[PDB]
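Example 363.
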Amino acid sequence: TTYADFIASGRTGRRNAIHD
Amino acid sequence: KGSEQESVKEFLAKAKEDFLKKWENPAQNTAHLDQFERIKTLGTGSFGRVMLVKHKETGNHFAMKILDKQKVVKLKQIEHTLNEKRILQAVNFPFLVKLEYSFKDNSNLYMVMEYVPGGEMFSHLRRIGRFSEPHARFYAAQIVLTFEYLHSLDLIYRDLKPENLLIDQQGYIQVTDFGFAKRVKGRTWTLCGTPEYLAPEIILSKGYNKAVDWWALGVLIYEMAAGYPPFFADQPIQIYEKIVSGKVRFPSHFSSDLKDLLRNLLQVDLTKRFGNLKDGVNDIKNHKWFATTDWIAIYQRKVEAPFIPKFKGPGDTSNFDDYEEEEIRVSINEKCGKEFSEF
Ligand SMILES: Nc1ncnc2c1ncn2[C@@H]1O[C@H](COP(=O)(O)OP(=O)(O)NP(=O)(O)O)[C@@H](O)[C@H]1O
Ligand SMILES: [Mn+2]
Ligand SMILES: [Mn+2]
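Predicted structure in complex with ANP:
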C-alpha cells in the first residue's frame, strides 16, 4: 500500500531545509 | 463575501501601513544572553537550534532561535537571516509566531519568540497517521488566510511544511521559521525550501513569484489528509524528478472536492495554478472544498479546534522530541560583525 512504502522510506523523520 | 471582500480589502490596506512603518524602522538589540536561563532544545534545523528559555528577571519562558554567524556565512544565509529578522519583527497576524526580542554577540544571532507549546504539527500528524478532511480543512484555512496576509505585503514565505507549523494552546497554528521569507515585487531565483515541497519552477531554475506558496499548500493539504506527501523517495534527486513529471495519484478516500482543489494547486503550469490567476486567493476561498468554512470565525478564532494539546504547567515540553544538548560557546573575538550590522 502507499502508506507502507512511505513508512519504509528514508524520509519519514523531520525534514530540514535545503542549504547545499 | 461582497461586503466581507470589502472589509478584507480595507483591513489589508491598513495592516500594510502598519507593516511599512516597522519594515522601514526595524527594532534592534532588545535583550542580552544573560537575562536568560537555557532550559532545553525544542527543535533544530539546517541552520538553527531553538531552545526553551526562561527570563531570569521576569520568570517568563520564550523560545529562542540561535544562529552561529560563522555557519550563516558558510551556508550562504547572510541576506536570508537579515530578511528573516526584519520581516518577523514587522508582521502582525493571529497565525504567525511573535518575535519578542532579538540581539547578537560575538558569536551568534538570537531571536526570542513566544513559546508555542503544542509541538509541531509534524509530531501529531505522524503519530495519528493522517487527518480527517474536516481537520485538514481547519488548518488549510489558517494557512490560506496567512498567505493572503503575507502576499499582500509583497512577501513570499517559501518554507511551508508541518515541521514549521506549531500548535498553540487553543489548537490554532502558529507559523514559525521565516528563514527564506522575502519582500519582493518581481521574480526571485534562489534555489531554497525543503525537497518534497519545492514547486517545479524552483527546480527548473526559473524566476518564480508568490505561486510557489500555493503549490506548497497543495503539498501540505495532500500530506495532512493522505498521511504521506504526494512526491516521495529516499533521495532528493528522486523527489525532484517526480515533481517536474507532474503526475499525482490521490488516495481512494479523498473526496472529489478534495481531489479537485489539489489538481488546481498541484498545477505544474504556474499559469493555470490556483492562487496565481486573475482572481488570486478567491479561487481557493470560493472552492467547493471550503464551502463550509466561515473565514471570519477562523480569523477571529471563534471555531472550536479538532485537537487541543495538553500541557501540565509552563515549560512543559512534552509535546516536543528530545534532542542532544550542545553547549553554546561565545568567542572572545567578534565574528563577521560587518555582515550583521543591521541585525
Ligand atoms: N516559537 C517557537 N516555539 C516553539 N518551538 C519553536 C518555535 N520556533 C521554532 N521552534 C521549533 O524549533 C525548530 C527549528 O526552528 P526553525 O526556525 O525551523 O529552524 P531552521 O533551522 O530555520 N529549520 P529549517 O530551515 O526548516 O531547516 C522548529 O521546527 C520548531 O520545532
Ligand atoms: Mn524549519
Ligand atoms: Mn528555516
